Amino acid sequence: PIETVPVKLKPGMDGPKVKQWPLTEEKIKALVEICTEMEKEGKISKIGPENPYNTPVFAIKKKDSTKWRKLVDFRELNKRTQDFWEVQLGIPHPAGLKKKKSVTVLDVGDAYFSVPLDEDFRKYTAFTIPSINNETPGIRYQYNVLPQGWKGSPAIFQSSMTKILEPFKKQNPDIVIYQYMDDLYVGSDLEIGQHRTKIEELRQHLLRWGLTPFLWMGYELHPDKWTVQPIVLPEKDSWTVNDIQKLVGKLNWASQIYPGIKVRQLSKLLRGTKALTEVIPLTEEAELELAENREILKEPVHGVYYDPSKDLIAEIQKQGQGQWTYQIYQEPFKNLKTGKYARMRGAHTNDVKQLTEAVQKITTESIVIWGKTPKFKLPIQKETWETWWTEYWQATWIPEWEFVNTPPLVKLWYQ
Amino acid sequence: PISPIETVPVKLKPGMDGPKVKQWPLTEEKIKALVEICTEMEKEGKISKIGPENPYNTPVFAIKKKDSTKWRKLVDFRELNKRTQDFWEVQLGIPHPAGLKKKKSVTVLDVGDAYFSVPLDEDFRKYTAFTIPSINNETPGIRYQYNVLPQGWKGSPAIFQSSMTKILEPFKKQNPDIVIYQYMDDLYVGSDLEIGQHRTKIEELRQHLLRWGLTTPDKKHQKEPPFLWMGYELHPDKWTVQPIVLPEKDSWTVNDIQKLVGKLNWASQIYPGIKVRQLSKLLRGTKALTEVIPLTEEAELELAENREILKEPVHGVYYDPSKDLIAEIQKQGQGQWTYQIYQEPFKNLKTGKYARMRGAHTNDVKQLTEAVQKITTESIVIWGKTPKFKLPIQKETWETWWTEYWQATWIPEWEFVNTPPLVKLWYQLEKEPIVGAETFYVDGAANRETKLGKAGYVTNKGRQKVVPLTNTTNQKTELQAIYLALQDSGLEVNIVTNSQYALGIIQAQPDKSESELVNQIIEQLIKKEKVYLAWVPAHKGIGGNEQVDKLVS
DNA sequence: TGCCCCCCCTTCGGTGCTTTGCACCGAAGGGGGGG
Numbered sequence A: 001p002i003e004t005v006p007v008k009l010k011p012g013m014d015g016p017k018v019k020q021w022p023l024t025e026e027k028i029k030a031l032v033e034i035c036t037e038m039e040k041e042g043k044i045s046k047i048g049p050e051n052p053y054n055t056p057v058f059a060i061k062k063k064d065s066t067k068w069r070k071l072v073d074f075r076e077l078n079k080r081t082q083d084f085w086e087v088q089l090g091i092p093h094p095a096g097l098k099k100k101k102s103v104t105v106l107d108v109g110d111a112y113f114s115v116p117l118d119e120d121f122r123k124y125t126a127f128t129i130p131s132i133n134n135e136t137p138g139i140r141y142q143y144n145v146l147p148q149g150w151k152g153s154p155a156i157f158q159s160s161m162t163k164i165l166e167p168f169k170k171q172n173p174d175i176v177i178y179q180y181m182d183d184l185y186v187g188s189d190l191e192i193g194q195h196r197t198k199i200e201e202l203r204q205h206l207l208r209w210g211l212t213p214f215l216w217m218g219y220e221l222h223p224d225k226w227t228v229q230p231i232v233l234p235e236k237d238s239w240t241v242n243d244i245q246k247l248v249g250k251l252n253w254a255s256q257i258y259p260g261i262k263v264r265q266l267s268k269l270l271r272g273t274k275a276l277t278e279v280i281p282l283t284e285e286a287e288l289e290l291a292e293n294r295e296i297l298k299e300p301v302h303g304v305y306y307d308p309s310k311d312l313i314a315e316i317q318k319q320g321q322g323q324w325t326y327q328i329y330q331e332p333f334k335n336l337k338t339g340k341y342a343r344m345r346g347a348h349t350n351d352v353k354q355l356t357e358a359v360q361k362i363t364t365e366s367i368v369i370w371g372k373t374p375k376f377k378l379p380i381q382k383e384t385w386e387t388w389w390t391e392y393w394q395a396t397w398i399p400e401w402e403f404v405n406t407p408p409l410v411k412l413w414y415q
Numbered sequence B: 001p002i003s004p005i006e007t008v009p010v011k012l013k014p015g016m017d018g019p020k021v022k023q024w025p026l027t028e029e030k031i032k033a034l035v036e037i038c039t040e041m042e043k044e045g046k047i048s049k050i051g052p053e054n055p056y057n058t059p060v061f062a063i064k065k066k067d068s069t070k071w072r073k074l075v076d077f078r079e080l081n082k083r084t085q086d087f088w089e090v091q092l093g094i095p096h097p098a099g100l101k102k103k104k105s106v107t108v109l110d111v112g113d114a115y116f117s118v119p120l121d122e123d124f125r126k127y128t129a130f131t132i133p134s135i136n137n138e139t140p141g142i143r144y145q146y147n148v149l150p151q152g153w154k155g156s157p158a159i160f161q162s163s164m165t166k167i168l169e170p171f172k173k174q175n176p177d178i179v180i181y182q183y184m185d186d187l188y189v190g191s192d193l194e195i196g197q198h199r200t201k202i203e204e205l206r207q208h209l210l211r212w213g214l215t216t217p218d219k220k221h222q223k224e225p226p227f228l229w230m231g232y233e234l235h236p237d238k239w240t241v242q243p244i245v246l247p248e249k250d251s252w253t254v255n256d257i258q259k260l261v262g263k264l265n266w267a268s269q270i271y272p273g274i275k276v277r278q279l280s281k282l283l284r285g286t287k288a289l290t291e292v293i294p295l296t297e298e299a300e301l302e303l304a305e306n307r308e309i310l311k312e313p314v315h316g317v318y319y320d321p322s323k324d325l326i327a328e329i330q331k332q333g334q335g336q337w338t339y340q341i342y343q344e345p346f347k348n349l350k351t352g353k354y355a356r357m358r359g360a361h362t363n364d365v366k367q368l369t370e371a372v373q374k375i376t377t378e379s380i381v382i383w384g385k386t387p388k389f390k391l392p393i394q395k396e397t398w399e400t401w402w403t404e405y406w407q408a409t410w411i412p413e414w415e416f417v418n419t420p421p422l423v424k425l426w427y428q429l430e431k432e433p434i435v436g437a438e439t440f441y442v443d444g445a446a447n448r449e450t451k452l453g454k455a456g457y458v459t460n461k462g463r464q465k466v467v468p469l470t471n472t473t474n475q476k477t478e479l480q481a482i483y484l485a486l487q488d489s490g491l492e493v494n495i496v497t498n499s500q501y502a503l504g505i506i507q508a509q510p511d512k513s514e515s516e517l518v519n520q521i522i523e524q525l526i527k528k529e530k531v532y533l534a535w536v537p538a539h540k541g542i543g544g545n546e547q548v549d550k551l552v553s
Numbered sequence C: 001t002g003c004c005c006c007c008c009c010t011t012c013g014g015t016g017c018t019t020t021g022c023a024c025c026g027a028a029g030g031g032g033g034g035g
């Protein structure tokens, strides 16, 4: 007896028509078991080829999780679904969530299955489960309730969500709660023991609605301990000709961000035509230029601030030895945040795992800090990334990415 | 009494009406054979005759079946297909025998007139109108509309293919001991039952399909091996492809070469070591489909090498899920790679080859990674898991590559196999400048209008050179200037350029390239013992960079 | 002189940085195969 919220597409756009990519045996077995149980419970229904729309589907396992989790690559549908900020169903972003000492993430996506979907919109949620060795043609399904991973599911359900959270937000007014896609970010400044206690209260607080992948898992963040990676000039005494050449190349690049950087008195040290390993002293005018340039790299970049109407963009640089640097920006050279990762899972043996782990780490930070997911510039070939990333993905969301190939002519973010 | 096959709702694209294409002239031999087949469809109820209220029409023709005495009726629905709604094809790929598991009982079935046994959408039959001449357009003739799925409509395969699954769905759930490979009307049914209990379930399936209007004639019913399935031959323990016909024509046209490479690619799934590089290299160019090409010395030898492979009959084995999958790749040279997938030694499940040349400058390590990725996708399609790899590359060679590459690259669980030729990096750039090596400050320049340019270097020991170049670009001179530094330097040399373009190519350690200049640079680097490359910005008064930029500009 | 799917090889035009040359890529047209 619940009326369905009518949903339209962006005018001038069709539905998603993305082909299903091959799936491993263990993921197909997980999906068939899940798509059979969801068919018994009427949450999904079989369709035919007359539905011209399709969206990829596969399964994942979250961190320290042993049971599979269905994940649908709704990236094409979300881009083509009407932005619910125009419908005013958008969720405001609390600027204090990044200031809490602890933030627990809860997968509340299972509650979306209780709300029906607009009938005229169900044809856009079509997906196809493949078969191993193409034994069976595509078994196509579509959604009848709010699907997990669609950007409209938390927007429609937010009206119901604000009611379920009312008693807990009033008994604990210092706890900040943010909702993004299937996740619920709960942040407090309490002790870790009292934080997890309030988290367990929030779980049992949701069970009181469940009676009237699962909710038991939670992942602890600490945004107050997040640090940034600035551009740094190395400290040396005996600079070789090649040392100053690399430094001048680095400073010249950095001048695109810090316009006060000068290199006139350092370039004149490279006046002659000397061997790369010849040690040269630092002139008096060059000593001040290097010291003055370090001070410019200390102060912040002028005029950098987050525009909520602009897309976030993230670049990543593979530095080797398990080191990975990244920068989040909206306009070029106006970086909102720079950082570095190290000793991630897969260090010194699997790059694709680390890059997949770093994309998840960056995306999680962008959700906590701005409530958005950035578009990634991944330092990897297209086929290399498309072959393995699904084997190491552990999140319920999937960011947008393009592929780049920029050799490191100037080691800029890491010495 | 047969249960109705539920009609699939079919629409046209918005704001589009049905087709009106009339009919092209047809020869009398075809017009006569058509009226006989159409009368058979009126008898069985597959085609209605009434349509004076129907302004639509689609052209019709007829070609014979493959090596059969029966003509096949086809309708050119290309105008209807443009105006019909889009379908999502449920056919995602082709089944392969190397993914089959051995069974004790096997049967092959084929539904008769399969498209004509599924009721078309009621409101859509008006747009399937078509005319046929009675006697050379002397009299008007018989008009008809399709009451079932026709042949030539873009939705006919997908509709029948999904409808076939709905009919088999209750049978497969109530018989989990059975495996059914459905591909259009072709049906492969295998089980580990007594082949008598198999014949029972097969007849149960024959009646169950006959309970929805799908006939299974005995002419297409295969009960005894070898089972001709998907263009293969299925024996109880092994499988092989149906025989391959190589055209032995002594005057090769472009279309002959295209047919040759196509059949070699098809045979390369089970016949190991098939090459098509030198043969397809004859095909490159803007030549017409009929131009005669003389086979080059390398292409004739490569064609002879393929003849030797296809002389001996080769077979594959079936998939045992209890054993691991093994994939072993061999380098064939000139960017060619073959591989075999097996579970027990010398018993290949299937073979294949990767000869794709992506990028203007590459090396064997990249091509091997691309080959591993092609195998991984293929294996997950066929068996749903990634095979253990046996690669002709040493662990130290791979570790040196992926740790130092700026891009993220990775190969799954793999072990080294000493099967020459081995894949290796032919040179490696030092990370730090070389003490005691001459430092070559290098630069080039070219005029955008005259296409003239100069390229040269200046070293710390006083050595200099400038060379004028004609019909050149800024990028070529920058490459040409590095080439001069490599030629006139000792075994160890430091090279400082300002060319981001040239430095990006060389730092990727290519061993092969489409550019004659890059290859000569590669040849020089392999001769060297220590090479250090460094980049500095231009027009900043740096070292010899300002000195050499003036000499070239 | 039809339809749908998969594969490889070559060509060609669009796209974005190596920049107005050069490189990459997806579409398309040739072939093979299946029903």
Ligand SMILES: Nc1ccn([C@H]2C[C@H](O)[C@@H](COP(=O)(O)OP(=O)(O)OP(=O)(O)O)O2)c(=O)n1
Pocket: B110, B111, B112, B113, B114, B115, B116, B151, B152, B184, B185, B220, C003, C035
């Ligand atoms: N050149 C071809 C061959 C086949 N098919 C499609 C339409 C057929 O319905 C289906 C199955 O092919 P068959 O040769 O088995 O034809 P029917 O199954 O149509 O006839 P038969 O009684 O010979 O089995 O494949 C097609 O469109 N074009």
Ligand SMILES: OC[C@H]1O[C@@](CO)(O[C@H]2O[C@H](CO)[C@@H](O)[C@H](O)[C@H]2O)[C@@H](O)[C@@H]1O
Pocket: A018, A019, A021, A056, A073, A075, A076, A077, A386, A399, A400, A401
């Ligand atoms: O890796 C990109 C790859 O994915 C495809 C299909 O899987 O498209 C998906 O990814 C795109 C890149 O973000 C999205 O734009 C798109 O919505 C999503 O379906 C292919 O297009 C592409 O080859």
Ligand SMILES: [Ca+2]
Pocket: B110, B111, B112, B113, B114, B185, B220
């Ligand atoms: Ca048939």
